[PDB]
Design a protein around this nucleic acid. Sequence first.
RNA 1: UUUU
Lengths: 53, 198, 358, 316, 422, 466, 56
Amino acid sequence: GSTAQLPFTPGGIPSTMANATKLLHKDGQGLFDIPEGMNRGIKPMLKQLNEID
Amino acid sequence: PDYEKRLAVLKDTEFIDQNHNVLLKGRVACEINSGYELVLTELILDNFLGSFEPEEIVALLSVFVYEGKTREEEPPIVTPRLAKGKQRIEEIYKKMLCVFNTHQIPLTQDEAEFLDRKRFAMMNVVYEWARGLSFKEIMEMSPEAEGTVVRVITWLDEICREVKTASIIIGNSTLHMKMSRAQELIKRDIVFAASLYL
Amino acid sequence: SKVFIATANAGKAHDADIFSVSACNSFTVSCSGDGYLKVWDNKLLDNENPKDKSYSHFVHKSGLHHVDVLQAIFELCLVATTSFSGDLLFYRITRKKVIFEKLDLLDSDMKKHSFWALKWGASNSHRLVATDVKGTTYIWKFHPFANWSPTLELQGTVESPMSQFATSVDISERGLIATGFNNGTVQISELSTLRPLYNFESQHSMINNSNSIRSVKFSPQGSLLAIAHDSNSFGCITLYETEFGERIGSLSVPTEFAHSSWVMSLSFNDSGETLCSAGWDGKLRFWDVKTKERITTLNMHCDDIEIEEDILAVDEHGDSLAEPGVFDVKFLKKGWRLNESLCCVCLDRSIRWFREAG
Amino acid sequence: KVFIATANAGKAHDADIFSVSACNSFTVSCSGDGYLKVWDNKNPKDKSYSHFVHKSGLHHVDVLQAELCLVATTSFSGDLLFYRIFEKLDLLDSDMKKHSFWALKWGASHRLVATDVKGTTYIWKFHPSPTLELQGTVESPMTPSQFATSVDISERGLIATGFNNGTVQISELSTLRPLYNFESNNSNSIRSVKFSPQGSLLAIAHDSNSFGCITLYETEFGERIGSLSVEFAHSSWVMSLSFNDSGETLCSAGWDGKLRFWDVKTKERITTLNMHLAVDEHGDSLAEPGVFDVKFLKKGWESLCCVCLDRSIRWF
Amino acid sequence: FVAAHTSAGKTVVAEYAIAMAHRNMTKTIYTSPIKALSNQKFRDFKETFDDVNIGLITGDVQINPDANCLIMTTEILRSMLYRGADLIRDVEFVIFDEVHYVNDQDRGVVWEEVIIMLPQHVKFILLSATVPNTYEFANWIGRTKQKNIYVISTPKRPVPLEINIWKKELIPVINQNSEFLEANFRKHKEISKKTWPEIVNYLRKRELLPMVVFVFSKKRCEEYADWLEGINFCNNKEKSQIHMFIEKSITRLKKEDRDLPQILKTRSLLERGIAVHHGGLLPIVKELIEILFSKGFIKVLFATETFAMGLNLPTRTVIFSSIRKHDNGLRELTPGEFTQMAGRAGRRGLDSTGTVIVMAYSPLSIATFKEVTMGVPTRLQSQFRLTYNMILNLLRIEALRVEEMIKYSFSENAKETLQPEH
Amino acid sequence: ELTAFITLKEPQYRDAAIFAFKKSIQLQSNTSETWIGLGIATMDINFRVSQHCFIKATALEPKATNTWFNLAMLGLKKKDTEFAQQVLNKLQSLAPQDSSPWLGMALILEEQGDIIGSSKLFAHSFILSNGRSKAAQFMYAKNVLENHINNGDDERDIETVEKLTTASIALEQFFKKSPDSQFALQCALLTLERLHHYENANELANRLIGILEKKFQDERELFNFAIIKGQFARIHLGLGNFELSIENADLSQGIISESKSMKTKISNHICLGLSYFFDFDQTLNQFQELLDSKHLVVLIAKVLYDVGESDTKEIALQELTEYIATSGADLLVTLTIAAMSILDDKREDLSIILEELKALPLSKQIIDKHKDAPYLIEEITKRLYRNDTGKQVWQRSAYFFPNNLKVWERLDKNIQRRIASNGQNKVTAEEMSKLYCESKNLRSIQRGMFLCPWNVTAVKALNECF
Amino acid sequence: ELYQSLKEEDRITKLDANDIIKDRFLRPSNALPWSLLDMVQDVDYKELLKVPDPIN
RNA sequence: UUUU
């Protein structure tokens, strides 16, 4: 095997879309602007209605 | 509580960040399955070993596989770069030990007594084995028995494999070539002779 | 394909350099520059000296450098060899001593050519291929019966693509012929038609003329071709794909090169998954064909000889033979000598046998 | 400390004089013409004698005295010949005579050390009916091997070998085991290695890219203690080194025709003697090619001897 | 889960599991924590089975990778599990051997992490020596993996043992029914370079050979072996056979390797029926000695603890030169270690009883003797430990929380008050 | 539709892709690949919507590393270097075995101005790719070519030749997938002309010339055509087709005769002169008279001397002496003058040449690895004096440089055979076979003939053995 | 011509200026060295991406 | 001063 592979799930040991993006900073006009784990977006130098769950 | 203290230690030395995500150093340390991942990662992470030879690297890496329990006095180092590597490893371990004792993590017998035992006493033997000397001279100069020397070299093979993988992760081609060359250099003769059961 | 154990050995086997070796189910045959042909019985016992089960025959005063053996089921066993003067000589082996019968199979007009390389093609009629110093390849069909009455029938010739020295030749089980030349060019032609198919050149550069093909081998499946060639004091191996004629890759190790000095011979195992190469630097290396990565390495010393009186540490001039170069290497099928086997010949006039663990 | 010219003899040899040596009675010098000349120590041309050894020339020579007087020399054919001062001896075996030898040194049981062209060092033991018996051998540290250019042996039992790639290996004489290993178009060939007569000090005549460097190491620890400079000691290659009886001053001969004397304790220069640093623009010495070898002579024979490119031998 | 004395027949269960998995056309994995038993197990299984393939996987070598039964160590299996090896797809049984084996300074005894990380379709066959702590670990495995575990424990021994004490006398102190005798102990209480010749002469006269002497010192083994000069145990035919075997075995080595001092000394002792086994030997020498002992050409052997865990040690007698062993200082032998070492003193079908002798050079106290010989067996302990590598790997595999894996480890007196979001 | 739009680069496919992606998202919004595709589709129109789509795709499927690379490349598209660097650092911490993060880091470093780190990262990306990326191969070949054009290298350097060979192999594999690429074809021609692979260069140059001819009315097109024609004339000159080389050189010179142009002019002059020399001496003389660097002068002097005229020889001597008096003293010019004087047999200058050759500085002796100065010194000494005092320079050379082969080639042949063996020196099969055959033994002659059966001397020696 | 001659104990074989100078110092070549080559030679972000795979 |  390799470290690029994931292990098979062990045995015995223990609104998904809505719960996935609950902590994403939604900017004005209703759109995500900051990736998770970061603190900024890109600074250059209909899509909102798509909330169909 | 031990898990929390180890998380604090891993975050302190920049292995993982405040969100408990694995950084580059932690990613490299994931490969090292031996007992000293942090010190080995700190050793091979920068360009310290960029002027060493494959024989010198494989000789220096023997500190991590030799228990260091011996009575005979250490002879002088056979190469100045080996002395430099000894000093670097000692200072890295002192810094790491201070960081460990800051967070009051209990230490095993081997981890606490690392710098007290003569753990650099097989660098000359491994060096001369990698140069091409036969087992007779090696035994005439070694401070241990045949089994200990065979065990040390056998474990050094796997250490070389792990360092090859870590170097592939880091992005150091020269280290990868040196480790492959050393692996081919030390794997020969009676030390790696095939078993009588095969 | 990862552990090899020495089995039997023989030192000072010949009076000069042992240039080639070949094997069949019954025995192993070797040639040398002293002009003798030696037969080593494959079916040995425990703790039996191989020099006790050996049979020699004098062939030519000039010396021999190529040999091949054909065994097929009436049981016929043929040996063909080439001498330094340029003759092609055929012998029939019969058994419990061993009898050598010289066969006159070539006509008068075919005895004026100087041959270098040769190879047997077994039926799956048997065929023989050979190369000329002028750069030509000859194709023969062997008919044993008309009652024993052997004849060699000429099928055709293949001319050189460019003329250069033809140094190596091989024939596959699917009906292909590969010829190597001294400038690094390899030609592949069809057996049933004698028409060339592919022509690829394997040179790293053409600044200097130190490129030369030393060995060409076909995979046991026949879908792959391996080439050993020089690169101005280095040894290189390149893999090609024979169905469409395209470069696959190269075998290399830190020492872009496969060996440190020169690659003399190549060999595939029974399944075609492992390749072995022999080097002038005194090493045998084993490679994985799919991953193109080195697996193992064997080292040759003059001190490997079991009998201490047959150890040749130095030659007649005083030069050291502590790590001698390997001339030729051969894989042996399972059951010839449980698992596969291996044989090689070196500069210290020794012949050595190995066994695969498992 | 000053030195005054004492005697001179021009056109001593027909070809280049490559090495010089002396004892309490005689001074010997070899050349490329195949002659070795013995000069009386008590003009010196009227007290000189010549003998023919080999037609290929000679490049090394040494003298052993202990009433015994023996001379060993090496030829450009790889030969190694002995003479009892002139009576040619036969001490080498038939199979050992097939080797090729480059450098030698008499280690005053007596010892003889020699190097080969393949990087191998041979150690013998002389037994006066004279015989030799091989004590052992030392192989090349590196693979592939290199040319073994220099060799020396100390009174305390140490052997130093220098190679053409810049590597110096220190090995013992009791057990023949290695002790140290230093690795100091460019050239880095080790031209000369010397042991201080008293103490623990090794001087190595290093090579730069057309420059001469001298570096000092100390034994029993293998630590570099510095280098002599005026970090180049000469404007051209440094050919040979020499200590005196006390061991406090070290004389160096260079390819620039100058003899610079140094102080061991202070690592500072003392005086310069010109046989006949300035660099024009590339690294070329402004001076002319000079000295091949130098040798101190102790009191009662202090003096020194010098062989130059001008085919003359000079005493001071 | 099987817990029984060694040589009671625990390998029959493993062989039946291998054959049963072969019938279903699935695979089996055999693991051990000692790297010197993989080769012995490989040879033994390849000799035992026909039409079933056997393979061996180690750090570098691979033998028959596409086999039916693969042999490795537990660290190799753990690395495979963490790296998602495709080999585990077809594995039906995993066999854990030498579960009771405990050693603090050995980072290769990791079998609880292996149990935690195994998939749902894999069943277990755990084998160990007799321990008083079986049900807790079996219950933890059953609860954690949600598999039905059955506990088989057997104290019966195929060959009974006797315990004796050696001045030119052999006084039996414990009979075959484990009944301590005090009259003979008191009689013993009433009553060097010449000890071992005398012991060997007495045993040869009584015909209780071969023997194994357990010495807890590498140098003392060789000193005692050298103190046996003048004694011989072989005739010309056996000496020739041993010479031929060694000559054929060391063929794989160079000439300078065959001339090593240990090989010369080992051959010199071996051609007389004597041998030494400890951890300071070259591996090939140890293999040669073990094979020659198995074939039956060796009558006297001096061995350390490295021989107690070995596979084939058929001996009529076992001798204890001492009861204390250095581990952090000199320490008396635990009852478990003594039981494990002394249980090898019987041969099934060739012996009627097992002889075990304790050497008294001044008498020995009764309290320590009874504690060492007749004592409560050592409990089964948990060797699970937290390492930076495991934490980093589990943080890299963002699908399994480290706290959850921590809370599912074994712990004596764990809190049964966990209500997850209840 | 997205694949078609990427390959053909036409607006009408982007709108169809957007339509299909929006309809699929309406039917089911739980899938991540749809958001990835929608982000890629609008990556050029509105970067905010693309960033939103990439972030949502990361949220839905967080074990996918292609979203992070897409977001980093989008950041690089709008010239935000630090954002891309942070994303690439995270990606490297997440998927080290991938080759895309290394390529992105190398691009950022190359833009910043670093050279060594950029080369190291490009090499790592190429090695990790294992033939699966065209961009990695192209970037690696371009980097290798950019580092070895005016770096002052010699053919004897093994590493440079191996780098060029690897670049050529990478470019062949690249051409198997994307032919008709002008920049890659130019780089391939530059590498092949330097590896002396003239037939492959001929084929690739024919393809490139056809492409440029089809593509053409402007000015830069004519200049690029002239440069390509100059290189193509060089390829014919190296291939042995002198007439075609002359024709191409004339055509290229015609269009750039009234103007980077200096290099083409020099190349055209060299090619025309060398083509005419191989035999109209008048045109060659005129073209070489039409023409520092120490190499053009040596080549011109060689050609003019080989012409065979007194005026040509005088011109060559005058030019060499002018270079010596202007730019100082060097080894090659002095050796050429010495060879010309020795061949012409001029006694007056021979003594001065011998003195100058014997008065060489040590630096020139270190540079001379072939030992030409001792050879010429011995030749002049033997011719002038008819004595045997010329071996002394060989003895001194063997003293100073004892590991060389040419010094021992004269003194002792056993030394030369032993020095060249076992890898102590790098030696080819022809030289080793010659060394073996010079032992006069039958075994050695057989071994040398085995190593090189096309060697005349080995066959002759074996025949003479009997 | 020599192999035809070959067609018809370690024995010892019986086998024993201006051209060299002309060939080594004054012979021009049509293959340009690297020095002359140095004197005369003159040296989309959406295509780096991966399009996702189809779904069945 | 066993074991790795």
